[PDB]
Design an enzyme around this catalytic site. Structure first.
Site, PDB file in Angstrom:
ATOM      1  N   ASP A  87      45.030  10.474  43.219  1.00 31.69           N
ATOM      2  CA  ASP A  87      46.331  10.115  43.416  1.00 31.69           C
ATOM      3  C   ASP A  87      46.687   8.595  43.650  1.00 31.69           C
ATOM      4  O   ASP A  87      46.462   7.982  44.700  1.00 31.69           O
ATOM      5  CB  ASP A  87      46.951  10.882  44.788  1.00 31.69           C
ATOM      6  N   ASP A 116      52.589   6.880  39.738  1.00 29.59           N
ATOM      7  CA  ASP A 116      52.294   7.889  40.604  1.00 29.59           C
ATOM      8  C   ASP A 116      51.498   9.037  40.038  1.00 29.59           C
ATOM      9  O   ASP A 116      52.285  10.036  39.707  1.00 29.59           O
ATOM     10  CB  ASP A 116      53.249   8.334  41.623  1.00 29.59           C
TER      11      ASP A 116
END
Lengths: 329, 6, 329, 6
Positions: C214, C34
Site C-alpha cells: 500500500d 494510493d
C-alpha cells in the site's frame, strides 16, 4: 455522609476508573464512567476474543436476578466498537442498586488496541436516553424515578495521581469537593452533557461552540480548524501524520483556553492540558489535545477540564454545574 | 487518546 | 522513455506525492498515489471547508470535456472520510489521458487534521475494481484496453529524501529502477494488492499472512497481537494514550521484518521503517509500526517497504513483482 | 500515521 460515592482511581495519570457490580451476587467490574455515552456493558464469560483475557467477566448463570433478553447489539464509540447482546440484572453503583438493561459483550476485537492495553473491563454510560442504544433510561434517572436517590444528579471529582483519589457522587452535591460557587449551564440538548460556550484561545474565537463534558474522553478535543489556527506560531511540533503535538513545557507562548457564558468563565491553562514526556526528551511536554470535527463545531471538555473543575450533571434541571475542584480533600 | 459514543 | 512516467516527490521520508491533471484545461493537482484504494478524487471549487481553502480546487465549469453525474458518494479510508459527488472528465496522468469517473469532494472534515497538514490535494487510487466505489475500472486497466499502454501494469520507484526523486511508471517495467531479480508473488485476491507471505521477526511468526502492498500507508502495519509480542523485546517509549512509540534511531534491538514466500525473501530494517523526529530530539524516531486488526490477520507493507523495494503491480498476471530498489538513479 | 480504503 448521605450520598453514595464510587471511589475513582487514576489510569496512567489522565483517565480514571471506578468499580461497580452486576448480578445479585455483586460480580465486580472496573469501569470507565462515561458521561459521553449512555449504555452499560461488561465482557461476558461468553466472550471469545483475546481482549477479554485479562478482564473480569460476567456470568449470568451465577446470578438469580438475571433476566434473559439476547437481542444483539453493537456499541459504537469514536475510539472503537464492542458487540454482544442485551441482558438485564441487578446493577450496583456504590450501595445503590436497580434492575438494569446492559450489554454482555462477547466480541472486543473492534476496540483494540485500547481494550487490551487498558485495565478497565467495561463502560458505564452516564449520558441521556437519546444517546443510548436500546432506549435505555439512564441509571441515575431510573434511580430517582424509583425514588432511591434525592436528586437525579451525579457529580465528578477527579483523582490526581500523587495527591488524592476521586469520587463519582450520586444523588447530591458535596461542598468538600469544590471551592467558590457553582455555576450552572443549561444543556442545549438532552443527548451528551452538551452546553453552549464561547471558546477563546488566541485571538481565535468560536462563539456559541457546542461543548460536551465527557469523563470518558482523555483529551480536550477541538475543531480541527480551531486547532490549526491555535498552533500557528506557538513553537509546537506536530509530528507528521500524528496527533502528537510536542512542546517545551516552559514554552512561554502556550495559551489559556477560555470558555465563557453569561453565567461564568472557565479557563484551562497549559498546566492542565500539557502532559510531561520527559522520557521522550528533557523538559518536553505533549499537548493533550486532538482535532475532531462533529457536524456542528464542538469541543469535548474531557478529563483535563474535569481535573480542574468539579462538575455536576443534573438531569432534573437539565444542566451542568461547574466549580473549581479542591486541590486536596 | 481515547474518546468515548457515536 | 517509451513508458509513461510520473515524477514523485518525497515528504519527510514518510509519504510521497505525484501530480496529475483533471479537465481539458490544465488544473494541476498533487495526489497521494494510493495502491490501497481504487477511486480518484479532487477537492471541488464548491468546497468551502478550511482544508480546501489551502488546496488547488477543481472547477468543472472551466472544462468542456466535463460531464455531470451528481451521484452522492462517501469515500472511507482507515485514516478518514471525504464526501462529494461523482463527476466525469479528462484525467491526464503523465503524457497519457482518458475520460474517467472521479469524485468532486465538498466535505473534508472527516479527513482532518491530516488533510490540512499535508500538501496533497487529493487521492488517486491504483487498486482493483472491486475495491472502488461506483464500480470504476482502474485507470491503468482502461489505458491498456484503449491501447495507450503495452501492459496493464504500473511500477513504483519511491523517492528517498536527500537522495533522489521517484517515479510512478505506467505500462512497463524499467530496469533502471532496481538491482537483482524481480520476484513475482501472486495476489490472493483481486481487491487490494494483497499477497501471502510468512511474516517473522525472530520467533514471532505469522505464516501465510495477508500482506497488502500500500503506497498510501505511511507505516508498517501489523496485527495488534504481533506488535505487542515485538514490544516485549524492546524498551521503547510509549506516547501517553497513543499507539505510538519513540526510540533512538540507532537502537540496535529494533526488529528487522522478514517476509518469506516460496519464491523470495524480503527484509525490512529499521532504517527503512522508522520515522525520524530530529526536530524533537537528535537521533529520535517514531517506531512507525502500527497495530491494525483486519478480519483476517494482515500486514500493510506501506511506504517504508516500498522505499526499499521497487514494486510492480501487474493486473494482467494478478501479481506484485518485488525487487531491491536502486539506491540512486 | 496515514492509512489509505475500507
Amino acid at each position: 455522609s448521605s450520598n453514595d460515592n464510587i471511589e475513582l482511581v487514576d489510569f496512567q495519570n489522565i483517565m480514571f476508573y471506578g468499580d461497580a457490580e452486576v448480578g445479585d451476587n455483586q460480580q465486580p467490574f472496573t469501569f470507565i464512567l462515561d458521561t459521553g455515552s449512555a449504555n452499560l456493558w461488561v465482557p461476558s464469560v461468553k466472550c471469545t476474543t483475546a481482549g477479554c483475557l485479562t478482564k473480569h467477566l460476567y456470568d449470568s448463570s451465577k446470578s438469580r436476578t438475571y433476566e434473559k433478553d439476547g437481542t444483539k447489539v453493537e456499541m459504537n464509540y469514536v475510539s472503537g466498537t464492542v458487540s454482544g447482546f442485551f441482558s438485564k440484572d441487578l446493577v450496583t453503583v456504590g450501595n445503590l442498586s436497580l434492575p438494569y438493561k446492559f450489554i454482555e459483550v462477547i466480541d472486543t476485537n473492534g476496540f483494540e488496541p485500547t481494550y487490551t492495553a487498558s485495565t478497565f473491563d467495561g463502560i458505564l454510560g452516564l449520558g441521556w436516553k437519546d444517546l443510548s442504544i436500546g432506549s435505555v433510561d439512564p441509571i441515575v434517572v431510573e434511580l430517582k424515578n424509583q425514588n432511591k436517590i434525592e436528586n437525579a444528579l451525579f457529580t465528578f471529582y477527579l483523582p490526581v495521581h500523587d495527591k488524592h483519589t476521586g469520587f463519582l457522587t450520586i444523588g447530591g452535591i458535596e461542598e468538600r469537593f469544590y471551592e467558590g460557587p457553582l455555576t450552572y449551564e443549561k444543556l442545549n440538548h438532552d443527548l451528551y452533557w452538551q452546553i453552549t460556550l464561547d471558546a477563546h484561545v488566541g485571538n481565535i474565537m468560536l462563539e456559541k461552540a457546542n461543548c460536551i463534558v465527557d469523563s470518558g474522553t482523555s483529551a480536550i478535543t477541538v475543531p480541527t480548524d480551531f486547532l490549526n489556527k491555535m498552533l500557528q506560531n506557538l513553537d509546537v511540533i506536530k509530528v507528521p501524520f500524528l496527533p502528537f503535538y510536542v512542546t517545551l513545557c516552559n514554552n512561554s507562548k502556550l495559551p489559556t483556553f477560555e470558555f465563557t457564558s453569561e453565567n461564568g468563565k472557565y479557563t484551562l491553562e497549559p498546566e492542565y492540558y500539557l502532559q510531561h514526556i520527559e522520557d521522550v526528551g528533557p523538559g518536553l511536554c505533549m499537548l493533550n489535545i486532538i482535532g475532531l470535527d462533529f457536524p456542528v463545531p464542538t469541543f469535548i471538555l474531557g478529563d483535563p477540564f474535569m481535573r480542574k473543575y468539579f462538575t455536576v450533571f443534573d438531569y432534573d434541571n437539565h444542566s451542568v454545574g461547574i466549580a473549581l475542584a479542591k486541590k486536596n480533600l | 487518546x481515547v474518546v468515548x459514543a457515536x
